[PDB]
Design a protein around this motif. Structure first.
Motif, PDB file in Angstrom:
ATOM      1  N   UNK A  65       0.826  -1.196  -0.024  1.00  0.00           N
ATOM      2  CA  UNK A  65      -0.060   0.090  -0.066  1.00  0.00           C
ATOM      3  C   UNK A  65       0.753   1.407  -0.082  1.00  0.00           C
ATOM      4  N   UNK A  66       0.329   2.220  -0.602  1.00  0.00           N
ATOM      5  CA  UNK A  66       0.681   3.808  -0.468  1.00  0.00           C
ATOM      6  C   UNK A  66       1.033   4.156   1.368  1.00  0.00           C
ATOM      7  N   UNK A  67       1.697   5.240   1.159  1.00  0.00           N
ATOM      8  CA  UNK A  67       2.292   5.586   2.419  1.00  0.00           C
ATOM      9  C   UNK A  67       1.160   5.322   3.376  1.00  0.00           C
ATOM     10  N   UNK A  68       1.552   4.413   4.417  1.00  0.00           N
ATOM     11  CA  UNK A  68       0.291   3.863   5.286  1.00  0.00           C
ATOM     12  C   UNK A  68       0.780   4.467   6.827  1.00  0.00           C
ATOM     13  N   UNK A  69      -0.397   4.575   7.471  1.00  0.00           N
ATOM     14  CA  UNK A  69      -0.357   4.626   8.742  1.00  0.00           C
ATOM     15  C   UNK A  69       0.143   3.329   9.735  1.00  0.00           C
ATOM     16  N   UNK A  70      -0.056   2.483   9.121  1.00  0.00           N
ATOM     17  CA  UNK A  70       0.225   0.951   9.926  1.00  0.00           C
ATOM     18  C   UNK A  70       1.675   0.998  10.163  1.00  0.00           C
ATOM     19  N   UNK A  71       2.512   1.926  10.240  1.00  0.00           N
ATOM     20  CA  UNK A  71       3.793   1.886  10.516  1.00  0.00           C
ATOM     21  C   UNK A  71       4.129   1.717  11.908  1.00  0.00           C
ATOM     22  N   UNK A  72       3.095   1.176  12.743  1.00  0.00           N
ATOM     23  CA  UNK A  72       3.294   1.070  14.006  1.00  0.00           C
ATOM     24  C   UNK A  72       3.906  -0.323  14.466  1.00  0.00           C
ATOM     25  N   UNK A  73       4.797  -0.538  15.593  1.00  0.00           N
ATOM     26  CA  UNK A  73       5.541  -1.467  16.024  1.00  0.00           C
ATOM     27  C   UNK A  73       4.540  -2.661  16.090  1.00  0.00           C
ATOM     28  N   UNK A  74       4.768  -3.671  15.186  1.00  0.00           N
ATOM     29  CA  UNK A  74       4.173  -4.789  15.143  1.00  0.00           C
ATOM     30  C   UNK A  74       4.940  -5.798  14.116  1.00  0.00           C
TER      31      UNK A  74
END
Length: 88
Positions: A65-74
């Motif tokens: 996906x495009x620049x995604x906020x899912x960039x959390x620590x997981x």
């Protein structure tokens, strides 16, 4: 900027086995691609060669996906598995 994802992507290497690389990267304030850029450069191929992002959890599967906020620590988060044709 930190989320540890080992990805399993078919690398365009000297034709060694498909390369899974653990890149810890997130979408910085600029792009999601910086994580992708990590995989391709790890393979000594131009960035273009890998993109497929599929989430592991209740969020099942997906695409890079495009620049995604899912960039959390997981750690088990969205994996990529891609093969392009390219090599350096």
């Amino acid at each position: 900027k930190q989320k540890v994802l080992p990805v399993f992507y078919f690398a365009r290497e000297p034709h060694s086995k498909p390369i899974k690389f653990l890149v810890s990267v997130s979408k910085e304030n600029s792009t999601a691609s910086e994580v992708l850029d990590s995989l391709s450069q790890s393979v000594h191929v131009k960035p273009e060669n890998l993109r497929l992002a599929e989430v592991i959890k209740n969020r099942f599967h997906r695409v890079f996906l495009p620049s995604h906020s899912l960039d959390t620590v997981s750690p088990s988060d969205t994996l990529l598995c891609f093969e392009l044709l390219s090599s350096e």
